[PDB]
Design a protein around this nucleic acid. Structure first.
Ligand SMILES: [K+]
Ligand SMILES: [K+]
Ligand SMILES: [K+]
Ligand SMILES: [K+]
Ligand SMILES: [K+]
Ligand SMILES: [Mg+2]
Ligand SMILES: [Mg+2]
Ligand SMILES: [Mg+2]
Ligand SMILES: [Mg+2]
Ligand SMILES: [Mg+2]
Lengths: 149, 178, 96, 169, 221
RNA sequence: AUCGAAUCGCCACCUACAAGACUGGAGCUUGCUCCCUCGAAGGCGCCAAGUAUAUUCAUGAUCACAAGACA
RNA sequence: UUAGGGAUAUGUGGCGUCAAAACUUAUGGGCUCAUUCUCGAUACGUGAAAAGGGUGUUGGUGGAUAAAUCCACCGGCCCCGAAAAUGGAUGACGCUUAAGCCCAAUUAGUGAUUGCCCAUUAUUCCUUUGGUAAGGGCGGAAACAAAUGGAGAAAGUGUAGCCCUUCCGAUGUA
RNA sequence: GGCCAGAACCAGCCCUACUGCAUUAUCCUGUCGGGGAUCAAAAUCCGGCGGGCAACGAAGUGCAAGAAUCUUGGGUCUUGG
């Protein structure tokens, strides 16, 4: 129904829903567990921020192909997620050539505060808080092809 | 495993003509992998017995006969096979099976193993379920005991295909290469 | 032999149904040369500069009933010096 | 041990689409095949099983050859063979294997946490016991060395050497 | 073999600790010779480093006299013009196993020679192998699942000792001493093993109850 | 000291041993019954040294040999 | 049966290692044990063997007698017959709960009717080349400087082939 | 940027899922009589007689045409965007 040219157009799979806890498979924070917040418009990348207090993953954008979306979810409805726009991650271009902007630090601080509260309010919140602090690794003898997530 | 032979009843006749306006209708018992082989055997029997060729006849039916409910039974199979030196040898054997098709397939395997006979040199004369007290061979009669039991010895038990391994620790179940 | 396609045996993948899970996954052969040449993020990440090199490819289909997989490397075949050597089968592109 | 293949013997299916399921032998066809049925299992209707695919159990209900379904049900209920089997360790292991097969990532994390907690408390208990009665390598070595160290450190030259080089620390 | 002084100085200069590669040690006792050899050959071609011990306890189907006559027929082959440089007929069981594995490999290519050189074979379990780690077996190649028990079989050590192997008694004495020493050490350390078992039992009464519940759900308690 | 490398499980609980026509133990009835620790796990390791109240992680900006490796 | 390349299928032949494929498949049935040319395992290729024999084992057929026997007679596999000159060839190793032989499957009495691996073959895609080739267009369509959409358009055997579209064939000694 | 890599979507292919129709009877039951074997049975087995769908994950029997759109299958560094 939604036109392919409209920003509201997504072909994302059902598992990568907002609130789902996802294992990061590539990039700097590989093996970490984050929380899927939203998907950027125009079938853009997912936005994950596993609370940086828990695992150190900031508000980042990640392709849905480099994440394993698990069946464990967290109620995100209390989290705004509106201020996370595509223009947040855009940067000015250099001309013929850790530090974080106050806008990015403020957005992370406000989002993570509402994200941590949503985890605490949820049943098994302490178990899911420690779930996000754990690290996923492929061990000798592991068979992820046989697993259920 | 289910039997590789199926029970077919092939009903056929010669095509009516001016000499034979109402031809005789023949019913045939065959055990064949498929209905094409069933019809081939039916027409071979009609040619060698009733002098009727497949080109001058027709087939009214080539249906399959459903097996009875599975019960451990004794099946008497009267069968015959051809060898060059021995000619036609007819024998009667007893088998322990759960179905007529299973017993006849077991008979075909037994003939192939013990006498080197193939499917097209074997004619099944009859197969029937006989009582316990009519069994002659002791190898079959030994299963009639009311209290029959035995242990499973020398069993090469293989692991599940998903759990099989190449290298396993000596006295543990831990797999080193799998 | 046809060098355009390679056979890869992954640990704990011992069935064709298991090898079908890895179809489309990325595959890497890591080796080293003799001199430090250019790499990804040669300027962004100078710590990455090394004699370490990697050839990338993808899983195309399973091979046999015992969990082997066919792999096609990007543009060029994998060297025959990689035979009997370690290969990395990554978990992306994810489908779960 | 080795339990005989008899009419009424309880067996567990080794491989196949019916694996890890428990049935009762109701008839013996020949040396290779038997007839198996279990009224309390949906997929365990009367069928033929190769004797290489069954594992005899220690329970054997009282039935006759080619017994009826009602007779099998009554014998199973009276003997309570399934209830007794459910209490063993291999049945619990089969159920745990199924649970692990169907487990999710959160369940795997929970199991890892439980195993780590048990390991930590086992370490604490072992340390407590080993402080009293040495069994570890370091505690046995300390017990062996204590007497010689006490003998060799009681000398005045040793004592003075300690005091002098401790006052410098 | 023996390390060079250059290698020792370089190791000291880099400061790296001791290193041991990933080596699979296989207890070849009561294994079928050809089937174990084929499995080991495929594993060697797949880049594995494999040490095999107790090569004197490998089994072959048939009578010992039949297999002795087979080895004598093998020994009958020699280059008449120059027996030196002809076939070399090794009598040790480990040498027999290595020859059998070599005949399952492309021995005339560099890849096949690397695969063959990745294999080490011993009689018995030598001291440098005893404590390296848990030995493994090949279930596809064990006699109790590969041989009809009614048929006769031969032991490779017994067959080889009658074709010109001199160290059967030496290997027997060394194996007897090894088993005695290992049995003494296993009779010891029983207190340590029982203490660890009791600690695992007692931890269940001190860990959280929901963790014990998870353990019971997954079959660990 | 060149030298940047490929390799990605630790253990001082596996790292003793034997058997499959058996190898938890009884009974006599000898294939059933009974008992037991119930006959289907080497121990850990996987991010709070432990299951909770924690806590630093960004800008390495969406994949790239893990940008690191004394477990 | 052969333009030069890809993908996907097959054929003959195979799936213990060499060597791709059953990481030695089944939750198929029997038969076979073979001590110095060392049982057997590839048709063609006696490219190794008979006549004759066996109280080896396991199947038939017709008799006889009464605790089941024994009498003749036919299969099957194995054994004896069966001796040559360099050391040697199932293909090498090896295999005998076959990796041998006869039969039958395709994940196995569960719920239907394609296990897997290898061609200069099949199907399809791309490019070339040549047709007993098949068609279109070819009366510049209107507009339109630079600084700051573009070019070309040949009435044509053969060219950098006038351009476009379509189909089919392509190995080869003298 | 006429380089390298990754994700999106198009179109065309190429793979997979998802199944309906017809059959059954030498069959399925019950009940009598035999017959069988047991300690007694039961069953295998054979006749009557009365029913009937073994029933759709019944059957390994014939043929299947089910829009991968509903219901974001997979692949295409095997095509071109
Ligand atoms: K000599
Ligand atoms: K067989
Ligand atoms: K042309
Ligand atoms: K011209
Ligand atoms: K791509
Ligand atoms: Mg690196
Ligand atoms: Mg192909
Ligand atoms: Mg292979
Ligand atoms: Mg032209
Ligand atoms: Mg030409």
């Amino acid at each position: 129904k939604v036109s392919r040219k409209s920003p509201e157009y997504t072909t994302l799979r059902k598992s990568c829903a907002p609130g789902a806890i996802a294992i990061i498979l590539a990039g700097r924070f590989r093996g970490r567990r984050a929380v899927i917040l939203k998907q950027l418009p125009h079938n853009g990348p997912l936005v994950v921020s596993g609370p940086m207090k828990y695992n150190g993953v900031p508000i980042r954008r990640i392709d849905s192909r480099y994440v394993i979306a698990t069946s464990t979810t967290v109620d995100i409805s209390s989290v705004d997620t509106a201020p996370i726009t595509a223009e947040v991650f855009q940067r000015p271009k250099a001309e013929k050539p850790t530090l974080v902007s106050d806008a990015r630090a403020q957005l992370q601080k406000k989002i993570d505060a509402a994200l941590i509260a949503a985890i605490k309010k949820d049943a098994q919140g302490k178990e899911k808080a420690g779930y996000l602090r754990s690290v996923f690794t492929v061990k000798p003898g592991d068979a992820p092809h046989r697993w259920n997530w | 495993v289910k039997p590789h032979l199926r029970h077919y009843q092939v009903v056929g006749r010669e095509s009516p003509s001016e000499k034979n306006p109402e031809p005789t209708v023949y019913k045939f018992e065959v055990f064949a992998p498929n209905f094409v082989v069933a019809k081939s055997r039916f027409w071979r029997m009609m040619r060698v017995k009733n002098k009727v060729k497949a080109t001058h006849g027709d087939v009214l039916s080539c249906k399959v006969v459903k097996d009875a409910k599975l019960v451990a039974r004794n099946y008497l199979v009267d069968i015959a096979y051809y060898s060059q030196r021995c000619g036609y040898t007819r024998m009667v054997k007893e088998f322990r099976d759960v179905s007529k098709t299973g017993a006849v397939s077991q008979a075909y395997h037994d003939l192939a193993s013990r006498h080197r006979a193939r499917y097209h040199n074997i004619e099944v004369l009859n197969v029937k379920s006989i009582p316990d007290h009519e069994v002659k061979h002791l190898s079959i009669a030994q299963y009639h005991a009311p209290n029959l039991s035995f242990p499973l010895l020398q069993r090469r038990t293989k692991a599940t295909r998903k759990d099989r391994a190449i290298f396993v620790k000596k006295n543990t179940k831990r797999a080193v290469v799998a | 032999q046809t060098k355009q396609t390679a056979l890869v045996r992954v640990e704990n993948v011992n069935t064709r149904e298991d090898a079908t899970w890895y179809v489309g996954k990325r595959v890497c052969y890591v080796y080293h040369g003799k001199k430090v040449k250019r790499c990804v993020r040669w300027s962004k990440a100078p710590a990455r500069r090394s004699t370490t090199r990697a050839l990338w490819g993808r899983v195309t289909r399973p091979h046999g009933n015992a969990g082997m997989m066919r792999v096609k490397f990007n543009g060029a075949s994998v060297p025959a010096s990689a035979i009997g050597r370690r290969i990395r089968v990554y978990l992306y592109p994810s489908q779960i | 041990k080795s339990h005989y293949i008899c009419a009424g013997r309880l067996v567990r299916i080794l491989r196949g689409p019916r694996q890890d399921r428990v049935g009762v032998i109701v008839d013996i066809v020949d040396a290779n095949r038997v007839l198996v049925e279990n009224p309390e299992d949906a997929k365990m209707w009367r069928h033929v099983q190769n004797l290489k695919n069954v594992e005899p159990l220690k329970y054997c209900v009282s039935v006759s050859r080619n017994c009826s379904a009602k007779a099998l049900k009554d014998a199973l209920a009276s003997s309570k063979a399934l209830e007794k089997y459910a209490k063993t360790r291999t049945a619990a292991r089969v159920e745990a294997k199924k649970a692990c097969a169907v487990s999710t990532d959160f369940e795997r994390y929970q199991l890892r946490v439980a195993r780590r907690s048990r390991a930590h408390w086992a370490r604490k208990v072992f340390d407590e016991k080993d402080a009293k009665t040495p069994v570890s390598w370091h505690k046995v070595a300390l017990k062996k060395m204590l007497k010689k160290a006490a003998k060799m450190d009681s000398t005045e030259g040793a004592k003075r050497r300690m005091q002098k080089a401790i006052a410098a620390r | 073999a023996f390390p060079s002084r250059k290698d020792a100085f370089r190791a000291q200069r880099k400061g790296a600790k001791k290193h041991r590669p990933e080596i699979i040690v296989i207890d070849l006792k009561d294994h079928v010779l050809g089937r174990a050899a084929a499995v080991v050959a495929k594993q060697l071609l797949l880049g594995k480093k494999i040490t095999v011990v107790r090569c004197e306890q490998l089994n072959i189907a048939g009578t010992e006299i039949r297999n002795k006559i087979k080895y004598l027929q093998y020994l009958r082959k020699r280059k008449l013009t120059n027996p030196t440089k002809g076939p070399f007929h090794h009598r040790a069981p480990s040498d027999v196993f290595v020859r059998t594995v070599r005949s399952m490999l492309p021995r005339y290519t560099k890849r096949g020679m690397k695969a063959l050189n990745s294999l080490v074979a011993y009689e018995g379990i030598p001291p440098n192998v005893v404590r390296t780690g848990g030995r493994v077996v090949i279930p596809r190649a064990q006699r109790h699942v590969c041989y009809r028990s009614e048929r006769p079989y031969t032991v490779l050590g017994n067959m080889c000792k009658h074709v010109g192997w001199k160290y059967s008694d030496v290997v027997a004495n060394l194996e007897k001493a090894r088993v005695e020493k290992a049995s003494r050490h296993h009779e010891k350390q029983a207190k340590l093993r029982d203490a660890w078992k009791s600690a695992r039992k007692e931890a269940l009464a001190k860990m959280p109850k929901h963790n014990v519940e998870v353990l019971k759900k997954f079959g660990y308690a």
